[PDB]
Design a protein around this ligand. Structure first.
Ligand SMILES: [Ca+2]
Length: 137
């Protein structure tokens, strides 16, 4: 397995507090906001974040690392949406809440090019410490 998320092109609904979208693919899973490795949107309707894998890949695993210092509850009631190279949805999963600072999803070789994480409660900022996307097997 290799983490092909690293340094892929990212974007998000908006940015607050220097929480750039790229911070979720910098290879640093520290969720303490002041360690400067956690994304942050404004209070959007909805807040979302997206990664472009640059071409279609066989996806083995997705790992999402939450913020940990404060407001950890914000990463809850959300959707993970995977799209093909033509921007059509190929997979959706709804998440009620995280119990630990992270969630792992096996994708069993699902082919996709883009991954969006989008909150279903409007007004809530999205903050991610790290989103890792594994291919290989
Ligand atoms: Ca990070």
């Amino acid at each position: 397995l290799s983490n092909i998320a690293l340094t892929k092109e990212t974007r998000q609904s908006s940015t607050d507090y220097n929480g750039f979208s790229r911070l979720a693919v910098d290879g640093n899973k520290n969720g303490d906001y002041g360690h400067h490795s956690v994304t942050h949107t404004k209070e959007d309707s909805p807040s979302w974040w997206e990664i472009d894998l640059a071409q279609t890949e066989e996806l083995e695993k997705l790992i999402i690392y939450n913020r940990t210092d404060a407001e950890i509850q914000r990463l809850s009631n959300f959707d993970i949406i995977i799209y093909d190279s033509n921007d059509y949805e190929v997979f959706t999963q709804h998440i009620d809440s995280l119990e630990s600072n992270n969630l792992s999803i096996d994708l069993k070789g699902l082919k996709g090019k883009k991954v969006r994480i989008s909150l279903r409660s409007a007004g809530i900022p999205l903050s991610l410490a790290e989103v890792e996307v594994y291919t290989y097997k």
